[PDB]
């Protein structure tokens, strides 16, 4: 059955869509031969979240969904994975993932119509659970980074359309989980508390949805969930792993007027600890990282609801092609993969370093 109580996670599997799993076998696959090949087979069936990048990217969102209630009827218990990401002036912190809506030309009314089709075809679904990430990078982005213009000057037009999003996306078969950074970002000292409220004060203006059941942490990063190991590059915090991370924001979300609170977090590019990262807040397309902890809802956590793969492995994070557009400078960091094919696009070099560094392996 799509509405449940408690994780959401629980009593439903998470569907692997076509979309990765053509990337992998069409674009991939034909330049692998005998083991890498068969292993690449195999990583395209594990479940992983589709990117609602673009308006353009929904029509995408209704045919997976075509397909689950597909497989659902014929015996099967599946649920629809996305993430939501077309905030006007998103990424404002960086450069590399410019979308495609601006707030001065007209960007707040053009989201509106971007969630309104979106509810519109989990409505049209209502018989399939459908978990969803909402706007990676973009209220840590209000925390920390407030000292660019960008950022600053965007901060009522993410508010607003963050609680178009969370209120107008509040239904039955429908589970949210608000993107919160990771470790290295908010998991600082200093920056705990003000997350804290932040995130609070989102969920009691939305009205306290019950679609809401928590945040999401280390989507598109690397950070280990449980090493027992500090990395080199972590050194100053104390929160040096997933796990600490929520256990420290957890209670602190409740201070604030939200209890029960629950966690999803990304292990797609954490397999590999430590990582190739010559310092902690360098983010594109690291060296010397895997395939990590596959997805699973018996996490051995109590704030934990489930291990998810929020960033699929082999698309590219940003170009390193100083000419071409989009150009974010981290991207030609010594720990970054080069060369780079624009965000969103296939990049087979970083796929394979990632299958030959599985962890779980693959081989
Ligand atoms: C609260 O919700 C209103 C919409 O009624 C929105 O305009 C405002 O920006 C939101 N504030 C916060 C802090 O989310
Ligand atoms: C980390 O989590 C994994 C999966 O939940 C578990 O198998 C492993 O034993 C944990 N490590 C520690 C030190 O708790
Ligand atoms: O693509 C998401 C990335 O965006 C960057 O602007 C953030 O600084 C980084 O921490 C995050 O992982
Ligand atoms: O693979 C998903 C990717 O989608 C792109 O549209 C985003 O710019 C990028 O940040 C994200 O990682
Ligand atoms: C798979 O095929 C693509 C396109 O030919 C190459 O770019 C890649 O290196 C691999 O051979
Ligand atoms: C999910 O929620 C619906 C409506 O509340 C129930 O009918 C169902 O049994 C499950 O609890
Ligand atoms: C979703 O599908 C998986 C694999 O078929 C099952 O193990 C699970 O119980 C649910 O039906
Ligand atoms: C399947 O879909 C992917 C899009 O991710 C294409 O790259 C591929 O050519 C095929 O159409
Ligand atoms: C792409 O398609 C191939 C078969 O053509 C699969 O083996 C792979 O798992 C992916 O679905
Ligand atoms: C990947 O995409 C190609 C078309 O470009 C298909 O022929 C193949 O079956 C896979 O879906
Ligand atoms: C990967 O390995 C399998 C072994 O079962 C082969 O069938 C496949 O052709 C590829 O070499």
């Given at each position: 059955?799509?509405?449940?109580?408690?994780?959401?996670?629980?009593?439903?599997?998470?569907?692997?869509?076509?979309?990765?799993?053509?990337?992998?076998?069409?674009?991939?696959?034909?330049?692998?031969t005998g083991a890498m090949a068969t292993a690449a087979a195999a990583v395209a069936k594990v479940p992983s979240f589709m990117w609602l990048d673009t308006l353009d990217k929904t029509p995408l969102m209704e045919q997976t969904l075509a397909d689950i209630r597909t497989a659902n009827?014929?015996?099967?218990?599946?649920?629809?994975?996305?993430?939501?990401?077309?905030?006007?002036?998103?990424?404002?912190?960086?450069?590399?993932?410019?979308?495609?809506?601006?707030?001065?030309?007209?960007?707040?009314?053009?989201?509106?119509?971007?969630?309104?089709?979106?509810?519109?075809?989990?409505?049209?679904?209502?018989?399939?659970?459908t978990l969803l990430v909402i706007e990676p990078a973009s209220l840590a982005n209000l925390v920390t980074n407030l000292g660019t213009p960008k950022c600053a000057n965007a901060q009522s037009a993410y508010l607003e359309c963050i609680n178009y999003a969370v209120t107008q996306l509040?239904?039955?078969?429908?589970?949210?989980?608000?993107?919160?950074?990771?470790?290295?970002?908010?998991?600082?000292?200093?920056?705990?508390?003000?997350?804290?409220?932040?995130?609070?004060?989102?969920?009691?203006?939305?009205?306290?949805?019950?679609?809401?059941?928590?945040?999401?942490?280390?989507?598109?990063?690397?950070?280990?969930?449980?090493?027992?190991?500090?990395?080199?590059?972590?050194?100053?915090?104390?929160?040096?792993?997933?796990?600490?991370?929520?256990?420290?924001?957890?209670?602190?979300?409740?201070?604030?007027?939200?209890?029960?609170?629950?966690?999803?977090?990304?292990?797609?590019?954490?397999?590999?600890?430590?990582?190739?990262?010559?310092?902690?807040?360098?983010?594109?397309?690291?060296?010397?990282?895997?395939?990590?902890?596959?997805?699973?809802?018996?996490?051995?956590?109590?704030?934990?609801?489930?291990?998810?793969?929020?960033?699929?492995?082999?698309?590219?994070?940003?170009?390193?092609?100083?000419?071409?557009?989009?150009?974010?400078?981290?991207?030609?960091?010594?720990?970054?993969?080069?060369?780079?094919?624009?965000?969103?696009?296939?990049?087979?070099?970083?796929?394979?370093?990632?299958?030959?560094?599985?962890?779980?392996?693959?081989?």
């Amino acid at each position: 059955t799509a509405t449940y109580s408690g994780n959401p996670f629980v009593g439903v599997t998470p569907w692997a869509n076509a979309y990765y799993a053509s990337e992998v076998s069409s674009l991939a696959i034909p330049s692998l031969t005998g083991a890498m090949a068969t292993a690449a087979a195999a990583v395209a069936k594990v479940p992983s979240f589709m990117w609602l990048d673009t308006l353009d990217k929904t029509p995408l969102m209704e045919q997976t969904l075509a397909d689950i209630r597909t497989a659902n009827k014929n015996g099967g218990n599946y649920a629809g994975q996305f993430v939501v990401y077309d905030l006007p002036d998103r990424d404002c912190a960086a450069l590399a993932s410019n979308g495609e809506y601006s707030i001065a030309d007209g960007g707040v009314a053009k989201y509106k119509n971007y969630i309104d089709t979106i509810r519109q075809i989990v409505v049209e679904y209502s018989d399939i659970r459908t978990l969803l990430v909402i706007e990676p990078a973009s209220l840590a982005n209000l925390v920390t980074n407030l000292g660019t213009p960008k950022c600053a000057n965007a901060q009522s037009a993410y508010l607003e359309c963050i609680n178009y999003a969370v209120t107008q996306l509040n239904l039955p078969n429908v589970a949210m989980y608000l993107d919160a950074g990771h470790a290295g970002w908010l998991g600082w000292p200093a920056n705990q508390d003000p997350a804290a409220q932040l995130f609070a004060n989102v969920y009691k203006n939305a009205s306290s949805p019950r679609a809401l059941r928590g945040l999401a942490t280390n989507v598109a990063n690397y950070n280990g969930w449980n090493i027992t190991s500090p990395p080199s590059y972590t050194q100053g915090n104390a929160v040096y792993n997933e796990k600490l991370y929520i256990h420290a924001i957890g209670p602190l979300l409740a201070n604030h007027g939200w209890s029960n609170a629950f966690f999803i977090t990304d292990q797609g590019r954490s397999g590999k600890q430590p990582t190739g990262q010559q310092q902690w807040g360098d983010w594109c397309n690291v060296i010397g990282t895997g395939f990590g902890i596959r997805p699973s809802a018996n996490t051995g956590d109590s704030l934990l609801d489930s291990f998810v793969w929020v960033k699929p492995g082999g698309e590219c994070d940003g170009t390193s092609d100083s000419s071409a557009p989009r150009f974010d400078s981290h991207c030609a960091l010594p720990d970054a993969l080069q060369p780079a094919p624009q965000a969103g696009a296939w990049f087979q070099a970083y796929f394979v370093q990632l299958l030959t560094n599985a962890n779980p392996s693959f081989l």
